[PDB]
């Protein structure tokens, strides 16, 4: 379903930002919570939320 496609996306996110943080990206990264604007409304606010204390 799309819930698990959400789940490995947003692990794919976690990914991404550990693999860019790793590469020192701060711009990209700083512009990657404003990639995931739209994304984040397909979800509840606490991931959501919770998602963006991550980053």
Excluded: C, H, M
Aim: aromatic residues 4%; hydrophobic residues 45%; positive net charge.
């Amino acid at each position: 379903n799309d819930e698990e496609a959400v789940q490995v996306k947003e692990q794919s996110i976690l990914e991404l930002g550990s693999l860019l943080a790793k590469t020192g990206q701060a711009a990209e990264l700083g512009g990657l919570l404003k990639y995931v604007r739209p994304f984040l409304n397909s979800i509840s606010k606490a991931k959501a939320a919770r998602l963006v204390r991550s980053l």
